[PDB]
């Protein structure tokens, strides 16, 4: 653990910039060679040429729901090896953490699975595990998107304490959505940020106001924009409406979520969120179980799922459950979509989520001091090499 | 001649040239500016005349390419004098900063085009009134489905002989200089091109049209965008619409697509003004679309062959809430653009003048301080109140003070 490494013949990112300089390595975390050179030695115990690719901090996907078979929000004999193997594939495509999410569910699934998933630092087993998404089932009715409509529920009875009493203790959770109209959702809000949960709002058919009062009462992300919310109105501008909005908190960068898999949103939507508020701008998969599999049906949470193409609908509707595409590809299809730097792509899928999760000085980042989690890319943006604690734990086929 | 013409000089004044106020004279002769280095250089002549202009801004004037009247006067009916409504209008709106515009018609049946189109040619600015650009066509060929305040029974399509439909029923279009129609109407291909052939500008509006459809019509020639989100589909993240054009990749490479925003407060929200600034600063125009009771407070009056209702700060087609136009001056549209938005001063000022002026090919002579360029320019406080206007360096309107 005590060596040092050093990678040389790469372009990082640094400060939203691609900069040809070297990384160096020690203990799982970036060091200033400044420093090192003046405390200790000037010379690695290991040098690793990257031929001039691309090295970029790992990317983190906070909402992801399964995939290759396994459904996070089952309750199975062995609910932690669906999750390592999930956390071991996504390793392929460049992913070093992510937020498992459960979806809509009866109280016993929580009770059953919530305590199976705790955080888990990333390592040669797979990416880490930063906590849970449970995304519903305190949402709208009218916008439930794919979430069965059985098992929606509402907080107006004892607020918090329903919210306990559904998924049991929260000390594995990270992240909650819910649709801020709900009744009493101020007094929810407020006690899960207290708790430092994440509160994201979605599934909400909330307009801009309700929006921003939630925001003043501690939500700080939006789930997967422009799905599963009303639509932008010139005169009801609704939840897209946040991206512009003047009456935050000062300083306050509000994060959105977006599915960059090129059947959730056309490119006019990525386009139109990246220029209006670029900061904010955060990709996750919404991967469903079928993720890896192809064509057939498969289950999420407590409905089933018809993939046919490269599309997941709700069996018998046309309603989208979620994602079929890995976080690479959606990285590259944003890059492409908007036509934006490879740097804001990167920052996306990486950098952004972390800043959310104020994980910025650990994760996210080549920064000194931060986690060596990072990827090799070429000019492309293809995964050639995926990196935790400054180890090689991927390499493409190549 | 350039050898005979008094040399003007306003000082103390901060220009808006370049995209910034620059604390710089503006010099002037013949009506138009001129760089003082070369004046200087090649003919060793200073001004003959200095004006100290307080400190204030200076800017170009502003261009209205959507007025449909004001002051009582409707531009779309068959009056005994049109031309005396039109002056009137264009000596009005000189306080509210505007130097040219263009007068604009609604959906109307062809004898009022024929009658009126005519009476209603180009004329250059002067202390009558802002200058004259040319007609403003919105309608009657555009989609029922968003037909907005204009009459269903006036409507009209293209599919039976296109451009011969077009010819028509405006008449001859010598005095035309912007059409709006829906380009999901049959044949408007060939409409467009024959219009651009013309020199008439093209704009979509009042259209159930898709992007590719709207796209579809900038390759065929189309070039403005009429008050973005009102009377269109809305924008939907699997189908974008006409909102979808600030985005596109996919239109002819180093034109600019311009579209008009409604910026008084009752149109569209903050919101909707950021979100198209943002995606597309470099396209938008302000324009008042100000109905003929634009200046006469509350009451009932006329927008063409509906009635209008004016109740609040808001003007309603009578018996229904479907908005007929607005109330708002241009320089009330600027000051809330500027507000609504926060933008700079610079990019509110080039929404009423610059991109207007670009739109119709003007940039050289309009919408700009830039040597050579006509004289017409405001004088704004910091505020952005219009204390005074200019046209071709004479000065044309002052406030009271
Ligand atoms: N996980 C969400 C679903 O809950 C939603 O149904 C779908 C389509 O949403 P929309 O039709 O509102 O764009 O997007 C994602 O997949
Ligand atoms: N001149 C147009 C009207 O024709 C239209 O009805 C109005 C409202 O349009 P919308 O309700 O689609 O926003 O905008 C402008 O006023
Ligand atoms: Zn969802
Ligand atoms: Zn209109």
């Not at 372009?11 to 420093?35: A, N």
Request: hydrophobic share 40%; with cysteine.
């Amino acid at each position: 653990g005590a060596r040092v490494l050093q990678f040389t013949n790469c372009r990082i990112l640094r400060g939203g910039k691609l900069l040809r300089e070297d990384l160096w390595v020690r203990g799982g975390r970036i060091l200033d060679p400044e420093k090192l050179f003046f405390e200790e030695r000037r010379v690695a115990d290991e040098r690793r040429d990257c031929g001039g690719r691309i090295l970029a901090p790992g990317f983190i996907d906070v909402q992801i729901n399964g995939g290759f078979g396994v459904d996070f929000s089952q309750a199975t004999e062995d609910v932690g090896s669906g999750v390592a193997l999930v956390a071991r594939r996504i390793l392929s495509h460049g992913v070093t953490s992510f937020c498992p999410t459960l979806v809509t569910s009866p109280p016993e699934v929580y009770h059953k699975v919530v305590p199976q998933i705790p955080v888990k630092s990333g390592g040669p087993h797979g990416a880490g595990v930063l906590g849970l998404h449970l995304e519903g089932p305190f949402i709208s009715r009218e916008k439930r998107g794919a979430h069965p409509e059985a098992h929606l529920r509402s907080f107006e009875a004892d607020a918090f304490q329903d919210l306990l009493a559904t998924y049991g203790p929260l000390d594995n959770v990270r992240i909650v959505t819910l649709a801020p109209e709900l009744g009493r959702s101020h007094e929810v809000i407020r006690a899960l940020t207290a708790r430092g949960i994440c509160v994201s709002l979605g599934h909400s058919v909330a307009d801009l106001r309700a929006a921003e009062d939630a925001v003043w009462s501690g939500a700080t992300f939006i789930t997967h924009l422009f799905n599963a919310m009303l639509p932008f109105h010139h005169r009801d501008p609704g939840i897209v409406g946040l991206l512009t909005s003047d009456r935050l908190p000062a300083g306050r960068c509000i994060f959105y979520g977006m599915i960059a898999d090129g059947t959730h949103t056309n490119p006019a939507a990525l386009r139109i969120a990246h220029r209006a508020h670029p900061q904010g701008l955060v990709l996750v998969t919404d991967a469903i179980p079928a993720l890896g599999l192809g064509n057939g049906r498969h289950t999420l949470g407590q409905q089933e799922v018809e993939v046919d193409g490269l599309t997941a609908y709700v069996a018998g509707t046309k309603t989208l459950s979620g994602s079929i595409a890995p976080m690479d590809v959606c990285v590259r299809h944003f890059l492409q979509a908007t036509g934006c730097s490879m740097e804001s792509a990167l920052e996306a899928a990486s950098l952004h989520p972390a800043q959310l999760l104020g994980l910025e000085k650990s994760k996210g980042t080549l920064d000194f001091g931060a986690d060596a989690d990072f990827v090799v890319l070429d000019d492309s943006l293809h995964v050639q090499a995926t990196y935790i604690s400054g180890e090689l734990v991927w390499q493409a086929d190549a």
